[PDB]
From a paper:
[name] belongs to the Fur (ferric uptake regulator) super family known to be dimeric, metal-binding regulators. [name] has been identified as a repressor that blocks transcription initiation by binding to a specific site (the per box) in the promoter region of target genes. Similar to Fur and Fur-like proteins, the [name] [name] monomer can be divided into an N-terminal DNA-binding domain (residues 1–94) and a C-terminal dimerization domain (residues 98–149 in chain A and residues 98–157 in chain B).
The structure represents the assembly of a homodimer in the asymmetric unit. Each subunit consists of six α-helices (α1 to α6) and six β-strands (β1 to β6). No exogenous zinc was added during the process of protein purification or crystallization, suggesting that an endogenous zinc is normally bound at the regulatory site, coordinated with residues His4, His6, Asn15, His19, His97, His99 in a pseudo octahedral geometry. The overall conformation of our [name] [name]-Zn-Zn structure is substantially different from that of the B. subtilis [name]-Zn-Mn structure, which displays a DNA-binding-competent conformation. Our recombinant [name] [name] protein with a DNA-binding activity, however, exhibits a DNA-binding-incompetent conformation similar to the B. subtilis apo-[name]-Zn structure. Alanine substitution of any of Y67A, N69A and K83A also reduced but did not completely eliminate DNA binding. This study strongly suggests that residues Arg21, Arg26, Arg31, Asn69, Tyr67, Asn68, Lys71 and Lys83, located on the positively charged patch, are involved in [name] interaction with DNA.
Author numbering:
A (entry chain B): 1 to 157
B (entry chain A): 1 to 149
The structure:
Amino acid sequence: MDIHSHQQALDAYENVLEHLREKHIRITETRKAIISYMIQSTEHPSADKIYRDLQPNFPNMSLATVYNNLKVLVDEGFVSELKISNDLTTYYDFMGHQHVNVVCEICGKIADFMDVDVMDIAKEAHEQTGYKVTRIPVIAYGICPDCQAKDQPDFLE
Amino acid sequence: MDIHSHQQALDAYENVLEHLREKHIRITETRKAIISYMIQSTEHPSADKIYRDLQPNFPNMSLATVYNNLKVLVDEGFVSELKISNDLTTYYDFMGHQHVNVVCEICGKIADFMDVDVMDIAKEAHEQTGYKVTRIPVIAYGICPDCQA
Ligand SMILES: [Zn+2]
Ligand SMILES: [Zn+2]
Ligand SMILES: [Zn+2]
Ligand SMILES: [Zn+2]
C-alpha cells in the first residue's frame, strides 16, 4: 500500500494486526491462525486448502469462516486473489508489507521504513533450502542525515 | 547468474570477492574500492562520476582505473552497462547477489541461499529515511527438512 509508519518495527504478522487494530477489527484466534498460515504459505492456497489445513486445530472452523477472513485480508490489502487460466478456482497469496528499523551507526538514532522485500527473501530461502521459514529478523544500519553533515567521529555507537 | 552456493554466508561485497577469487582474478585495492562504491550506490553513475566521488578518499584513483575495474565487473556479470547516447558517457548498474544463512530453530543446522533482494531493501531504506545505508546483516530462521513433521 501507500508509504506510512507505525513509529516502530513490525514484521509481516505484527503489521497486519496493527493495521487491523487501527480499523477496530476484532482479532480472533482463528483470524491470527489464518494470517500466520498465509504468511508461512509457500504456495497460493485455495479457500478449501486453507480450510482443510487448519481444520484439525480448529474443529469449529467452516469454509464460511475462511471466506470471511480472506475477505478482510483482501480488502485491507494484505492478500491478493490470483487466477490461473482455464481454472475458476481463486487462489490466495499473502504479500503484506512490514516495517524495518534503520539505526545510525554514529548516534544511534532510529528511523523506520516500509518493506515488501523480506517476504521475497522468505520465498527464496524456502525454495533453495527446503526449510519452512519461521522468521527473518532484519535491521538496517547507516548514517542519519544529521550525522552526514558533521565531521567524522572518534568513536561509534 | 544461476543459483549456486559457496557453502558460507557472504554479503554482496564478500560475494564479489569470492567470485573473482574462484576464477583467479586479482584483488587490488582499487578493485575493492570500486566494488564497494558500486554496491552502496543508489543511482546508476557514469565512469566520471565514480572517479570524482572516489578520488578525495582514494587520491590515486584515475578514470582509466575506473574503466579497468568496471570492465572486470561487467565481464564477470556483476555490472551492466547502460547507454542513452553516442558520446563517451556510459552508466553502470550493479547487479549483484549475496548468500544468506538459514538456521534451523530446532537442531541449529545451517543452510544458505542466494539472495538478490537485500540490496533492494538497502535502496528502499535510503529513499525512505535519507540514511546513507552501510550494512544490513540478515539471517533467516526456519525448520530444516529433517526436523519437519
Ligand atoms: Zn504498516
Ligand atoms: Zn546519526
Ligand atoms: Zn555467489
Ligand atoms: Zn533441523
